[PDB]
Design an enzyme around this catalytic site. Structure first.
Site, mmCIF file in Angstrom:
data_model
loop_
_atom_site.group_PDB
_atom_site.id
_atom_site.type_symbol
_atom_site.label_atom_id
_atom_site.label_comp_id
_atom_site.label_asym_id
_atom_site.label_seq_id
_atom_site.Cartn_x
_atom_site.Cartn_y
_atom_site.Cartn_z
ATOM 1 C CB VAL A 83 -11.723 -1.419 -2.455
ATOM 2 C CG1 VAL A 83 -11.768 -0.730 -4.399
ATOM 3 C CG2 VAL A 83 -10.101 -0.913 -2.264
ATOM 4 N N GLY A 111 -8.137 -2.199 4.732
ATOM 5 C CA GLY A 111 -7.268 -2.946 5.502
ATOM 6 C C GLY A 111 -6.331 -1.913 6.481
ATOM 7 C CB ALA A 112 -3.492 -2.892 7.703
ATOM 8 C CE1 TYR A 113 -3.364 -2.182 12.687
ATOM 9 C CE2 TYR A 113 -1.008 -1.271 11.611
ATOM 10 C CZ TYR A 113 -1.816 -2.665 13.087
ATOM 11 O OH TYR A 113 -1.290 -3.986 13.433
ATOM 12 N N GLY A 114 -6.825 1.233 8.246
ATOM 13 C CA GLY A 114 -7.470 2.421 8.361
ATOM 14 C C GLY A 114 -8.324 1.577 6.364
ATOM 15 C CB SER A 115 -11.443 3.298 5.009
ATOM 16 O OG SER A 115 -11.303 4.244 4.319
ATOM 17 C CE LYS A 130 -3.666 0.415 4.324
ATOM 18 N NZ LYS A 130 -2.928 -0.228 5.179
ATOM 19 C CG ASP A 181 -2.581 -6.141 5.662
ATOM 20 O OD1 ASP A 181 -2.241 -4.929 5.150
ATOM 21 O OD2 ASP A 181 -3.398 -6.751 5.601
HETATM 22 C C1 LIG Z 1 -8.953 -6.313 -4.178
HETATM 23 C C2 LIG Z 1 -7.276 -7.499 -3.452
HETATM 24 C C3 LIG Z 1 -7.256 -8.147 -3.533
HETATM 25 N N1 LIG Z 1 -6.388 -5.844 -3.714
HETATM 26 C C4 LIG Z 1 -6.308 -4.941 -2.994
HETATM 27 N N2 LIG Z 1 -5.518 -3.890 -3.860
HETATM 28 C C5 LIG Z 1 -4.135 -3.190 -2.987
HETATM 29 C C6 LIG Z 1 -4.561 -3.367 -1.629
HETATM 30 C C7 LIG Z 1 -3.621 -2.662 -0.665
HETATM 31 C C8 LIG Z 1 -4.017 -2.715 0.685
HETATM 32 O O1 LIG Z 1 -3.543 -1.678 1.721
HETATM 33 C C9 LIG Z 1 -2.376 -1.051 1.391
HETATM 34 C C10 LIG Z 1 -1.253 -0.860 1.583
HETATM 35 C C11 LIG Z 1 -0.069 -0.009 1.736
HETATM 36 C C12 LIG Z 1 -0.784 0.719 1.113
HETATM 37 F F1 LIG Z 1 0.741 2.211 0.278
HETATM 38 C C13 LIG Z 1 -2.180 1.607 0.491
HETATM 39 C C14 LIG Z 1 -2.970 0.498 0.639
HETATM 40 F F2 LIG Z 1 -4.567 0.241 0.324
HETATM 41 C C15 LIG Z 1 -5.103 -3.606 1.760
HETATM 42 O O2 LIG Z 1 -5.265 -3.541 2.486
HETATM 43 N N3 LIG Z 1 -5.783 -4.613 0.969
HETATM 44 C C16 LIG Z 1 -6.660 -5.282 0.946
HETATM 45 C C17 LIG Z 1 -4.872 -4.244 -1.493
HETATM 46 N N4 LIG Z 1 -6.233 -5.228 -1.620
#
Ligand SMILES: CC(C)Nc1ncc2cc(Oc3ccc(F)cc3F)c(=O)n(C)c2n1
Length: 347
Positions: free
Chosen positions: A27, A30-34, A50, A165
């Site tokens: 999707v 994210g911060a510091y990873g996919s 992530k 974040d």
């Molecule tokens: C459609 C979009 C708006 N919904 C959405 N939902 C969750 C995340 C989580 C992210 O980061 C994380 C933080 C903590 C975790 F334990 C796991 C994660 F993946 C992230 O970066 N994004 C962009 C996200 N976006």
């Protein structure tokens, strides 16, 4: 006991995750990873997983990995991203190499909602209330977000909001006509002084204004252009603020600018709720010492229909003494490992 893990290649990378997580699908960043969307069969929740990229490749990376895990483990609030799960396929510290973080999958961010259009005042009330509710909590733990912007604010179908974040951008990505800088307090954008929690309230002001008008408040083409946009609205700094600019260089540049008075916000935000205008005036103050706090903003009359002082919780104490600590890679790695192993899932 240890669940069974299975392997799957997704983002050019092998993902090894517990069986409970099914239908993994990328999707974005994210911060510091996919991040991958998945179905958590144990909770019935759609989740974001992530996988951190090279979490322990350097001291900076190792500490940042530890920092993110500590932050996410601490946050237990409706309007703040929380940790549903954290895992590693490693069976011991010796073989520990990868960290996976699990949170709720959110529907859309605030950018998808604004979409070049004005939101109704009642929608703005509810969204900003939730941001401030989350911020009160975050700030009570002496955590600063530092990078609040619409893309870090996720909202579901019922307009329920979570902040993503917090407490964690290079010079290049802060350069030019970019949203990465449009929401930043001027004192942090130009490194005027040691900043505090008040930088986040500036960001909320910028966000609130954008929700009300459908337009970026300070869409600067660069740092200097953005400062000019800011000072045109809120006025050039007085002698009082100038003294607080500890940077002699920045202070000297400020005084070169032709003085301007603060604008009339009622004339800037035509048609807006007078209570919204009042709140904006209290958030968008150049001198950070004088900005309204999250706790104070919650009690502002603009949020009369949502405010409940018995339902706006504060956080448990957050020990961030590690931030001033110098450790080796393996030491940060061991600390991270302990945090993974000690994790207790939320009810
Ligand atoms: C459609 C979009 C708006 N919904 C959405 N939902 C969750 C995340 C989580 C992210 O980061 C994380 C933080 C903590 C975790 F334990 C796991 C994660 F993946 C992230 O970066 N994004 C962009 C996200 N976006």
């Amino acid at each position: 006991e240890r669940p069974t893990f299975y392997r799957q290649e997704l983002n050019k990378t092998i993902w090894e995750v517990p069986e409970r997580y099914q239908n993994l699908s990328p999707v974005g960043s994210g911060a510091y990873g996919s991040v991958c969307a998945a179905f958590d069969t144990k909770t019935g929740l759609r989740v974001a997983v992530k996988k951190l990229s090279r979490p322990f490749q350097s001291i900076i990376h190792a500490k940042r990995t530890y920092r993110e895990l500590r932050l996410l483990k601490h946050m237990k609030h409706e309007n703040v991203i929380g940790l549903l799960d954290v895992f590693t396929p490693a069976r011991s510290l010796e073989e520990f190499n990868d960290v996976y973080l699990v949170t709720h999958l959110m529907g859309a961010d605030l950018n998808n909602i604004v979409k070049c259009q004005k939101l109704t005042d009642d929608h703005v009330q509810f969204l900003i209330y939730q941001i401030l509710r989350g911020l009160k909590y975050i700030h009570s733990a002496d955590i600063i977000h530092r990078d609040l912007k619409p893309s870090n604010l996720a909202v579901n179908e019922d307009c329920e909001l979570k902040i993503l974040d917090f407490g964690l951008h290079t010079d290049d990505e802060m350069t030019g006509y970019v949203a990465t800088r449009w929401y930043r307090a001027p004192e942090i954008m130009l490194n005027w002084m040691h900043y505090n929690q008040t930088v986040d309230i500036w960001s909320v002001g910028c966000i609130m204004a954008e929700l009300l008008t459908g337009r970026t408040l300070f869409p600067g083409t660069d740092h200097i252009d953005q400062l000019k946009l800011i000072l045109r609205l809120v006025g050039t700094p007085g002698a009082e603020l100038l003294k607080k600019i500890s940077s002699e260089s920045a202070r000297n540049y400020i005084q070169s600018l032709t003085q301007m008075p603060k604008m009339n916000f009622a004339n800037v935000f035509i048609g807006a709720n007078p209570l919204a205008v009042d709140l904006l005036e209290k958030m968008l103050v150049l001198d950070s010492d004088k900005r309204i706090t999250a706790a104070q903003a919650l009690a502002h009359a603009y949020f009369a229909q949502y405010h409940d002082p018995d339902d706006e919780p504060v956080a448990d104490p957050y020990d961030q003494s590690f931030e001033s600590r110098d450790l080796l890679i393996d030491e940060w790695k061991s600390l991270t490992y302990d945090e993974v192993i000690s994790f207790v899932p939320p009810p």
